[PDB]
Enzyme design. Sequence first.
Site, mmCIF file in Angstrom:
data_model
loop_
_atom_site.group_PDB
_atom_site.id
_atom_site.type_symbol
_atom_site.label_atom_id
_atom_site.label_comp_id
_atom_site.label_asym_id
_atom_site.label_seq_id
_atom_site.Cartn_x
_atom_site.Cartn_y
_atom_site.Cartn_z
ATOM 1 N N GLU A 44 0.860 -1.153 0.103
ATOM 2 C CA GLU A 44 -0.098 0.055 -0.129
ATOM 3 C C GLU A 44 0.782 1.466 -0.111
ATOM 4 O OE1 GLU A 44 -2.360 -0.281 3.424
ATOM 5 O OE2 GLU A 44 -0.983 -1.594 4.247
ATOM 6 N N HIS A 89 0.753 -5.116 -6.176
ATOM 7 C CA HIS A 89 0.647 -4.680 -4.779
ATOM 8 C C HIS A 89 -0.646 -4.967 -4.045
ATOM 9 C CE1 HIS A 89 -2.117 -1.380 -4.222
ATOM 10 N NE2 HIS A 89 -1.823 -1.315 -5.559
ATOM 11 N N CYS A 90 -0.244 -5.193 -2.906
ATOM 12 C CA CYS A 90 -1.518 -5.523 -1.834
ATOM 13 C C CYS A 90 -1.111 -4.899 -0.703
ATOM 14 C CB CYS A 90 -1.723 -7.139 -1.592
ATOM 15 S SG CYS A 90 -0.370 -7.879 -1.195
ATOM 16 N N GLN A 91 -0.618 -5.478 0.415
ATOM 17 C CA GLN A 91 -0.467 -4.964 1.802
ATOM 18 C C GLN A 91 0.878 -5.341 2.359
ATOM 19 O OE1 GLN A 91 -4.680 -5.847 3.539
ATOM 20 N NE2 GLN A 91 -4.357 -3.974 4.255
#
Length: 147
Positions: free
Chosen positions: A15, A88-90
């Site tokens: 993020e 992407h993610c976290q």
Amino acid sequence: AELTPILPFLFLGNEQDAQDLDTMQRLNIGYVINVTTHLPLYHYEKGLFNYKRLPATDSNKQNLRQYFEEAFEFIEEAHQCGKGLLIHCQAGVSRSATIVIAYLMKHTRMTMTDAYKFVKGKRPIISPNLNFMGQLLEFEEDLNNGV
Ligand SMILES: CCCc1csc2c1-c1nc(SCC(=O)C(C)(C)C)ncc1CC2
């Protein structure tokens, strides 16, 4: 905060890494894959990138194999026109790293363990997820048989 380059055009982050607009333009990125259900498409109103969202949660029953062919066609589009792609993610980068590894298995013809050791060496912090590992292991077995 920095963007991890797995391949020269494929980038892995979280993020915080995806909110740096100046770095993404310095890296010639034009495609963004968001592997979350709740994070916003960063810099969407600016109209600079092509976005694809893969709705997924970081659970032990989430299905990521269903999104592999959808994410591969989007990566090959960036590779075809010379642009880079950020996925992407976290913080744990579990969901996004699962897709990056699966790509290295299909189009680089690496084994799962070699593709994991490759990604882990570039981004050392990867949260483990036994569910996604089993999906990569079954996906590796389908690549070795022809599916
Ligand atoms: C994907 C292959 C992982 C693996 C194969 S053999 C072995 C591991 C391994 N993986 C992890 S975390 C990796 C993940 O779960 C993601 C799906 C988020 C990438 N920690 C420690 C080990 C030690 C032994």
